[PDB]
Amino acid sequence: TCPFYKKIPGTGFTVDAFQYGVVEGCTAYFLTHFHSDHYAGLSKHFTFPVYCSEITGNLLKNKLHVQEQYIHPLPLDTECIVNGVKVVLLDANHCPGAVMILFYLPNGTVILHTGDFRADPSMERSLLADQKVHMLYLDTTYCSPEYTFPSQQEVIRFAINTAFEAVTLNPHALVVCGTYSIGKEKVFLAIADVLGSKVGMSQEKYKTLQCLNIPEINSLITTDMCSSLVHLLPMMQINFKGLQSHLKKCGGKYNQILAFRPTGWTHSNKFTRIADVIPQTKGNISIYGIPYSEHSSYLEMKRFVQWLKPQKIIPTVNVGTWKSRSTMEKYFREWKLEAGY
Numbered sequence: 001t002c003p004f005y006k007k008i009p010g011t012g013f014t015v016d017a018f019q020y021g022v023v024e025g026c027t028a029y030f031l032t033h034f035h036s037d038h039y040a041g042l043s044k045h046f047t048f049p050v051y052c053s054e055i056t057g058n059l060l061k062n063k064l065h066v067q068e069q070y071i072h073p074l075p076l077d078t079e080c081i082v083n084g085v086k087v088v089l090l091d092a093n094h095c096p097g098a099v100m101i102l103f104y105l106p107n108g109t110v111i112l113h114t115g116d117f118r119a120d121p122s123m124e125r126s127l128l129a130d131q132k133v134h135m136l137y138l139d140t141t142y143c144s145p146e147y148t149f150p151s152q153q154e155v156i157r158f159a160i161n162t163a164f165e166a167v168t169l170n171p172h173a174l175v176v177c178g179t180y181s182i183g184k185e186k187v188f189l190a191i192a193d194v195l196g197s198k199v200g201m202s203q204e205k206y207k208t209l210q211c212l213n214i215p216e217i218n219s220l221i222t223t224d225m226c227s228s229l230v231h232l233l234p235m236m237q238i239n240f241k242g243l244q245s246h247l248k249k250c251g252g253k254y255n256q257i258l259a260f261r262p263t264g265w266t267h268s269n270k271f272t273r274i275a276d277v278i279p280q281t282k283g284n285i286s287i288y289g290i291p292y293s294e295h296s297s298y299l300e301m302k303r304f305v306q307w308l309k310p311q312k313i314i315p316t317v318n319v320g321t322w323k324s325r326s327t328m329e330k331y332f333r334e335w336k337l338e339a340g341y
């Protein structure tokens with residue numbers, strides 16, 4: 001059955017709750033973003049109202065084939081009424097179309113559900129600043145002090161200078177970026193922009209990008225692999241074997257590969273700055289691991305919550321074991337004692 005952390009008290013609303021069949025009482029199913037963990041169970045066969053951003057609705061329509069009658073897209077930063085209750089969607093700074101949701105309950109309680117998010121100080125001057133938030137449903141993916149990472153901008157600058165150098169040294173090199181879902185598009189679009197190229201990719205991946213309301217998209221991407229010097233491949237192919245195999249496929253148009261694996265955190269975040277990073281190399285193929293995160297670091301999460309001062313926190317990630325829950329509760333009390341709420 002649907003867990004309490006996916007229900008919104010005193011409404012018949014749920015959030016990211018599609019894998020449990022019909023939820024008893026639920027009149028509106030919200031979807032924060034188009035990642036398979038959150039949408040799991042949604043298909044062309046679902047027949048209840050789904051509320052979501054415009055981007056998320058394009059994806060539901062075109063990738064999952066959910067029927068149009070059941071998709072209710074809502075604009076951002078706008079007060080809307082859903083089944084008699086006032087809501088607002090805000091940018092989550094996660095992947096394309098990902099939202100936080102603000103619910104104003106009839107009794108006067110205010111609830112923020114973050115979805116998946118990367119907390120940022122620009123969220124301190126949104127509609128959130130205008131009133132007290134009593135309850136916070138929080139993306140606790142990286143809720144432990146070991147989880148540090150560079151800014152997105154530091155990582156992109158590094159990727160740009162690295163790719164530009166390699167291709168100026170060898171104008172027959174190919175750049176490859178690994179991918180598995182939506183998100184982290186800036187990695188490949190920034191590399192392509194410094195090399196004066198479009199990004200080549202499969203038909204399924206191009207169809208996905210074409211749903212994302214990215215300005216000038218038709219000038220940036222193509223299905224003609226031949227004509228482009230940045231290619232996208234599935235993350236699973238980003239290894240020496242997969243990359244040599246792909247290089248054979250391209251018809252001796254390239255004689256070298258430089259590949260990027262955007263990942264979350266891995267244990268080498270604890271010593272290495274972005275400027276110290278060096279690739280793994282085997283022959284004419286080099287692979288760079290780059291920690292481009294679309295989740296809050298510990299410090300980013302802590303700052304956001306210390307600013308917001310919620311009366312209660314409801315974790316939404318890593319809630320499956322008592323040890324994880326206990327650990328997280330300890331950090332929430334620390335934050336509250338430091339900040340005086």
Ligand code: NI
Nearest residue numbers: 033035094116
């Ligand atoms: Ni996500």
